[PDB]
Amino acid sequence: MLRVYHSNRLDVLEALMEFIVERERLDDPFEPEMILVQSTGMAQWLQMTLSQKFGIAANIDFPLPASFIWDMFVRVLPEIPKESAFNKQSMSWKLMTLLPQLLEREDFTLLRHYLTDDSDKRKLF
């Protein structure tokens, strides 16, 4: 199942997390304990408080939720590449390659006015 914990302060929640991870112990001693966070500071605070309670906090991974969901995609479904072909950067270079070919298509008149007046590719970029 999926368990949702509501609380008022992060200390109670982090103590509940410590209580769970001390109550039920991992099978494989080399298996990382994956915790989803967003920033670096929250990862640092979680590491320091876990170390203060247990004695050492290692083999803890702190991935972004997008990377975690992508790793779940890779592990569950097959024939999926490690990194997608659709990032922020590679799609920008693809749109560089594609836009002048796709212009003059009876529906890109405002883009034609934007780009075709003058360009040292700065507007296009």
């Binding site: 405002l110 883009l111 006015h113 934007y114 007046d117 700065r122 507007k123």
Partner: protein, 144 residues
């Protein structure tokens, strides 16, 4: 040149208000801002109430814009408390209060505008022009 009462001004077409020295341009702007917010006047009213982010006010100096924004928010807060209490001391707020038909609706509208004050549309000319060009960059043909 007709004399001006801010509760009788028709909000259509163009109006050229000539406010002399030491007269209360800020007071006139606050009164017309509240009237535009709440939709009052009847014949001299805009045909719909307006969201606070659709009230363009263009002012000279950045410090003047900050002062005007503070004045407008304070007047909104005082009028909202007046609409909640159904009673007031300021004569302009008294005239407004007897002008409004539905005071609970007025209180809700003013509460929403006051909470949305932090993105109000008060600009200098060079800020307004930059914002609208950055919006319609495709028509303007200029970078991002």
């Amino acid at each position: 040149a007709e004399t001006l009462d801010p509760l009788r001004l028709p909000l259509q077409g163009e109006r050229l208000i000539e406010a002399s020295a030491g007269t209360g341009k800020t007071f006139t702007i606050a009164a017309l801002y509240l009237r535009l917010l709440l939709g009052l006047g009847g014949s001299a009213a805009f045909p719909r109430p307006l969201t606070v982010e659709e009230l363009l006010v263009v002012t000279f100096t950045e410090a003047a814009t900050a002062e005007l924004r503070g004045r407008i928010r304070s007047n909104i807060h005082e009028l909202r408390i007046a609409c909640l209490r159904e009673t007031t001391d300021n004569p302009l707020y008294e005239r407004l209060l007897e002008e409004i038909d539905d005071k609970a609706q007025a209180a809700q509208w003013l509460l929403l505008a006051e909470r949305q004050m932090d993105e109000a549309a008060v600009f200098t000319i060079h800020g307004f022009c930059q914002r609208m060009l950055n919006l319609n960059a495709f028509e303007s043909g200029m970078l991002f």
